[PDB]
Amino acid sequence: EVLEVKTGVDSITEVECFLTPEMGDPDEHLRGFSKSISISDTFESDSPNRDMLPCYSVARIPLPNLILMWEAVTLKTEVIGVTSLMNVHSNGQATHDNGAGKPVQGTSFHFFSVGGEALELQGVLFNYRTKYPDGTIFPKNATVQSQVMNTEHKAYLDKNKAYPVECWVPDPTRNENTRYFGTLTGGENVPPVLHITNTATTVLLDEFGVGPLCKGDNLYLSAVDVCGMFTNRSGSQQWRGLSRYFKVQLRKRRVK
Amino acid sequence: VEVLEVKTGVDSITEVECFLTPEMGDPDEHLRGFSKSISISDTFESDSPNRDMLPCYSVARIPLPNLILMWEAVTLKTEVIGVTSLMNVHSNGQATHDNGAGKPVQGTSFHFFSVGGEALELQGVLFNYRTKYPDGTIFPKNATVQSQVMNTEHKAYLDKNKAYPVECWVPDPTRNENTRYFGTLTGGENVPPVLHITNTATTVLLDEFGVGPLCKGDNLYLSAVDVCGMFTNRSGSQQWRGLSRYFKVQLRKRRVK
Amino acid sequence: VEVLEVKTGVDSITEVECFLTPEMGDPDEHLRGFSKSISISDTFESDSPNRDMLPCYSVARIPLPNLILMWEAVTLKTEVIGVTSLMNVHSNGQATHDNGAGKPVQGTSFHFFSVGGEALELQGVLFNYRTKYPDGTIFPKNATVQSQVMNTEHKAYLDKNKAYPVECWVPDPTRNENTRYFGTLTGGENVPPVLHITNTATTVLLDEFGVGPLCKGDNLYLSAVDVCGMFTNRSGSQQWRGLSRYFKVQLRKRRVK
């Protein structure tokens, strides 16, 4: 039972923050990057290393202590540091003799969500015989059915650099108290197209005029921004990610 | 059917929520969601695809609470489930270049869904009328050369799962008054998958007179195809890859004469 | 014609529903919907395409119930039929790479459709004015070098099937006041077909005064081209591939003076 919005200057608040990407971080110098990608010798023997697997990012932001609950109404968001992908001089692979370095490009996933509780995930596997590595949280008791839909694979995005992007998507059968948005663009030569502006707002209210309601006075923000792959001079390839800005406006709502 | 007023009251609305799994061919016990690798006939007349090489339409007939009243489908939420699985570029695929990652799934895609109060109605069109379609599939019969453009003999109902090959059949635009259907074919061998997910998008199913699909016999028919492209193995062989599709439909009771 | 009021009543509306088959050249009895394989001339002056290598505009003149009143075309639903046929990549096609699937139909496409109350009016434009067009086609006559940009002598009516080559003719934008036309040329050898289907989309045919095409002599004219791209067989030779188009047009009776 959602009742009226509380008004007055005291009745609104704002959360502003950035979520850093979690791409694998193969050493102390390579934050924002994965380990170079290797290919298994057989389909059955797919065994990716942990630092080769991008993961979902999540932040739980505490809100002013308040029945009233904070209701998330609007979102401004964007990728931070888009211009960094213009570095084409840092030991990349030349496009042709005497040319500049190939820029970051190829398969991308750009995703963000705002909820009054953890994002709910459903597991789907490209290859059910993939061995996922220690330190990740992955679909357990995988069967061949996991390659299309196995409803045993349910989880909460409740830990950082744990949930690999390739294993998990938002569960469309749940997430009633979250709003999520994502685009996968696959293909080795796909160009990054990244828009920035401080003039665009997303409205988080549902068709009944109600936004995510924050349980325990916590706001859940989640993101993935795999921008593509950086190709080294040797030809080896690493995922490259960027941080995402969130600004969320909230208001006090009475509930029964 | 004269369509009359909508019922109101708590008893008068219901919701259907489910997923349709893809039917890409499943050539062995480990390859659900994939087809057999594609081979090419030496002539048009010798084209004889194996069944497990042919993606088919998916369909589910969903029973509704028993009810003259009929359930009317009013809105749809839908999306492709598992889009991020296509980021697996390390599972014995074909390197894009020396020391590179594996080619991701790409190329010819067909993304399609329908919601109706009866089975989707189909019209057959053949790329090559001399293609010999395999046992266990339901395909256009008595094909002639006119079947390559339009033969009105090829009518059917999407009334069985794992049966109707995608490449032979399309929604019949001369029929389907009681269904709403939506699809996109993006052809070309290097086409990138572009797959959007969100829980904030709704499609309204009402027609221009405010009437949605009316569920004959209290059954709702959901249909889908989501061929996302092809996976390329190290050897260079290629297999179709598909994903499941989520459907959430809202229905209301409607009186008819 | 001064346009006056619309007639009302059950008897005042009618519908046309049909399909137009493509006319790609049909080089033999097995290849309806295809052109002859494409060959290239040695020089501009020796360009000499055979008839079965030239796609042509499709047209149907549909008689309407005999009626001063005139039938007025108000709305259109239209759709390319057989889009999924283009997923046959196993039928004598050139492999994309060693051990890969066959190439899908792709490259240059023209998708076009028109609805009118008289024949579509055409203007001739030639890529190369010295092209010798074949017997059995209707093509710009007395061509000059000016015909490569605009020669106002080249006027015609789309009044016959398998006759007017797509490459020679376009809708005349200086005329066609009693027709609504819509077309897209997408050029390039690797262009991917993007073909959308749905039964939920309507095009309104009314002009800015609220008047649709008015059907002279109680005839409705539908025209189409759907060259989807080229099919490449295993030898590398290429052929245009086209598909049928569905039309459904709603009409009403309009009084004129």
Next chain:
Amino acid sequence: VEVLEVKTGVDSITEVECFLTPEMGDPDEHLRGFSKSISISDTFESDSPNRDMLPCYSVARIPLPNLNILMWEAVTLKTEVIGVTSLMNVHSNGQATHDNGAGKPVQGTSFHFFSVGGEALELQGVLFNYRTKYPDGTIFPKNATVQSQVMNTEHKAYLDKNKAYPVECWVPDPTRNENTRYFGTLTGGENVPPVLHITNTATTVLLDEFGVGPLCKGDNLYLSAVDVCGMFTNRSGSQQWRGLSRYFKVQLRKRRVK
């Protein structure tokens, strides 16, 4: 000009309908609508294009019915590229895309542009290379300096002559052109696919934010266009710009001014 009321009555409106042919270079008597094959200089400083290799802006000055204070005001535009299907000729001395394949279609860099004004389009010069030597018979930025590569305000002109103003040297001057409406798109890159739409159902409104269209001085309407569709590649691999004509239909009304 204080703009006052619009005149009404059967006599108060008129239409202009015409087409502008492209001016691509026309290297011989058989190649109207094409440029000369494109060649490339051996050094940056020695860039020296032939006249017949340079596409130019097209312009028409259209006399309107005599008014005299009343002026013709341009209110709406329908426009269309004429002959889009000609680009389906892939059998006329083209380079085959692969062994036994069809000819490569026209593709690559394009510029599609049109304007409607009550006076000549005003141009600003910008040079890719200020040391480019532009040929006799063209009108081009004079006294070019290195600043001409980004913005040299000396390079002002009117589009007042055909086969004269090379497309690559000139753009509409956004600091002027208040009595003109202009629209254009450059799509660059050697494999760019032409995407050419045609319909007789699309109208562009020419009124500004105050409800005032271009006012035609001396009762003349100015139409300008460029439609470089891409390049045609012949059997030898050499490449020529290909252009097409553009249709204009403009509706005008009588407006009183003080």
Next chain:
Amino acid sequence: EVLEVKTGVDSITEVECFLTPEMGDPDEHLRGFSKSISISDTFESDSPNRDMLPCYSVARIPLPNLILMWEAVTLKTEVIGVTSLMNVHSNGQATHDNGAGKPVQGTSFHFFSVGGEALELQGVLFNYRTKYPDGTIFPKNATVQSQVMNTEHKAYLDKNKAYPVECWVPDPTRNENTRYFGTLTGGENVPPVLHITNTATTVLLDEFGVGPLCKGDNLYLSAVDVCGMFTNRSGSQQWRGLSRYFKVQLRKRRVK
């Protein structure tokens, strides 16, 4: 406190100008171009020369002297000289035997902002061990966190030919008194798509009907228009940039 707009003939003014691009200008003939791009031998040794680094452009425009403040209400903007990119004959690299020169293409960044004070920047680095050259203003005290987000890297776009595009982006946590817009399109074969028209206006008012308010009677305009790279006959590549036109309409606003 923002109060009423002033009316009357004299209560409005316009600013019209162009900002020239700053791509690096490696010699006296190459305004609008960068130095040819070279690639470091190792990731760690990335050290771009100054004239190889495009920078943000900025102009501070004095307004009629005026509490009342000038409020920016509308913008028209356009890239100037788009057709110059049709020069495919000036010692470029033929796309194939006997073919024309490859046009300007590949990675682009088109960006513009209008503010009543300097654009505020946040630093993000592709490679934190990049040695940025003397004469540029770059993120100082870089750590591996600077590859994703280091909140120490704050600056104002207060100088021309100084702030490298690849190091800096607008700071979404600040910039309340500016409206900014940008698009990064990455990839070496990306085609430039450049539209021009004098019929398009952007409204600069925020959700409360308030545009940027010009402190000290100064209007701040900023831009980047890296259109892509030109490829020379040898294969060497140089960034190519173009000027940007700005027209801004302002009105007088009373504030307390």
